Structure 1
Amino acid sequence: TVIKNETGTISISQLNKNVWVHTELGAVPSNGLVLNTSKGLVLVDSSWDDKLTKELIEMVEKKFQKRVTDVIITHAHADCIGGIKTLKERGIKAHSTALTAELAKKNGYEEPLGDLQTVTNLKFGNMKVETFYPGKGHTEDNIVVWLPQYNILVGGCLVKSTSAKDLGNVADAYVNEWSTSIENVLKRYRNINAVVPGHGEVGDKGLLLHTLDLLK
């Protein structure tokens, strides 16, 4: 089940009952999650900019007939924090680590909450969400999101997709530590089912091993 906007730059596909993957084209695709809970919609990452972000919000709010209440920002790059201004004017709480918040400000973006600690567990209605900071990798502040009820891991851009052979922008990356950080994710979560890459199709733990291979 995949719904799209007339243009095709925004699509939302269902992973299971209350978990959907949202993808926006900036033409570079970017993934994030949409969580349908009993108390509203929760997104993992926004979009490239305020126009796409607003349109994404409008699309999901109309479909689920609920308001988007929270958003988890995985790192301070445009494909994740690009629509921060849109979130703040709609009363949407932009969760982030303190580091992501100071890097967002340093990059000309408005500041997210900076509330997430190294390990933070949030529960929206009956939906459980855990955020984890594994260390530096794709960026200095990147975090991953874990849904313990589905054993779904949002690796964000710390994880590359199956056909990806390029690590992407490494000017802000810590290539040498990236490997250790992925190992911390692997040691922390022993039974992973699906993992959503920052860009690309949903896969499994094999995506982390693949990324470790690219990093060698």
Structure 2
Amino acid sequence: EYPTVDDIPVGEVRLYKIGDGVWSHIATQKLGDTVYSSNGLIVRDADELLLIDTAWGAKNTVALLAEIEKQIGLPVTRSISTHFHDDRVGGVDVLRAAGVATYTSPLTRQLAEAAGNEVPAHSLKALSSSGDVVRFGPVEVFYPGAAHSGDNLVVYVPAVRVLFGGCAVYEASRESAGNVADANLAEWPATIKRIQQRYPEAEVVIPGHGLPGGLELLQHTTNVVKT
């Protein structure tokens, strides 16, 4: 019952409750003949929300904010983008228009600028070296090293053991690497091992695209990226 491209109506964004104070958000775009979905996270803190990733573009991000107000009814006050691609920063300007304080690592801001993408307003310090971790409200933000992209971050919600892997982690049904234009295929297995070692109690692992699973998605990703 996790939302998919087969059931989300065109142009809509859906939320899915994962645990106490934690939702995923799911949005779609059609590229060529194929409809794709992308996941992010929403985490409650006191009477506000922290958003992890845009909903992949400005139009979807406007829909996301409306869906959040309808279903949750608390303000999004901060966001984190987990890497520089459109599915993560596309819609940052919508978030800024809506009064959200937008964050990512310094490297992501640089890569987003270089790519001509939207750029979060604020940098997360102390994330520059592989293995760096910072607390940010109700989550930990971890830079595990280069994988899908040079800058990719993961986000853990310690109270409920939810790991948002972003595009560093593949869904179970995905058996080929697909697009690796910004990837570091050599470092990806080591990066996965760092995630495994850091979050051994995670109960839910959310990939950047596709269905949630558990810690088995980590080794699955290594297997696919070698393949």
Asked if residue 175 in structure 1 is aligned to residue 185 in structure 2, the reply is yes
After TM superposition, the score normalised by the length of structure 2 is 0.88
Counterpart for residue 212 of structure 2: 202
8 Å CA contact retained: 1:47, 1:79: yes
Runs of 4+ in 1 over 6 A off after TM superposition: 1-5
1:79-107, CA deviations, whole angstroms, 9 ceiling, x for partnerless residues? 11110111111211111000001111111
The answer (yes or no) to whether the contact 2:89–2:119 under 8 Å persists in 1 is: no
What secondary structure does 1:173 align onto? coil
Partners of 1:42 and 1:69 within 8 A in 2: yes
**Residue in 1 that maps onto 2:202:** 192
Instruction: Indicate the percent of aligned positions where both proteins have the same amino acid.
Output: 36
CA contact (8 A) 2:13 2:25 kept: yes
1:6: how far off? Answer: 5.4
What does residue 225 of structure 2 align with? 215
Instruction: Measure, in 2, the Cα distance between the counterparts of 1:47 and 1:35.
Output: 15
Matched, 1:97 2:100: no
Unaligned runs of 5+ in 1: none
SS of equivalent residue, structure 1 residue 102: helix
Secondary structure in 2 matching 1:162: coil
1:68-83 aligned within 5 A: 68-83=76-91
The offset of 1:214, in angstroms, is 1.2
Question: 1:121 is matched with which residue: 135, 153, 162?
Answer: 135
Whether contact under 8 Å (1:116, 1:131) holds in the other structure is no
TM-aligned CA deviation for residue 8 of structure 1: 6.3
1 CA distance for matches of 2:157 and 2:178? Answer: 26
Q: Distance in 1 between matches of 2:144 and 2:74?
A: 32
Match for 1:25: what amino acid? T
36-45 or 132-141: bigger deviation: 36-45
Aligned residues: 212
Q: What is the SS of the residue equivalent to 2:140?
A: strand
Alignment-derived partner of residue 32 in structure 2: none
CA distance in 1, matches of 2:210, 2:182: 21
Q: What secondary structure, in the 3-state scheme, does the structure 2 residue paired with 1:145 have?
A: strand
Q: Name the Cα RMSD after superposition.
A: 1.8
